[PDB]
């Protein structure tokens, strides 16, 4: 989890002209 980072993304890092990011159905806890 510490290796992959989104610090260089745009909207993914961050209203923004209708763009939207939906959460996955499975969160990281149940995947774990």
């Amino acid at each position: 989890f510490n290796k992959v980072t989104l610090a260089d993304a745009g909207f993914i890092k961050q209203k923004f002209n209708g763009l939207t990011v939906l959460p996955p159905l499975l969160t990281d806890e149940m995947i774990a």
Partner: protein, 48 residues
């Protein structure tokens, strides 16, 4: 191995026109373009 990209969706009408009713009216002349695009992106989202 990658498993699933981040699910994304876009409001075609508001994105293209930014709530401009005049632009929306002009966009109506193109037909179902926004519906088809939304459909495709939704399919991808379900695929994730």
């Amino acid at each position: 191995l990658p498993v699933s990209m981040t699910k994304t969706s876009v409001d075609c009408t508001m994105y293209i026109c930014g709530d401009s009713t005049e632009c929306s009216n002009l966009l109506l002349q193109y037909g179902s373009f926004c519906t088809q695009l939304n459909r495709a992106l939704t399919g991808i989202a379900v695929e994730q």
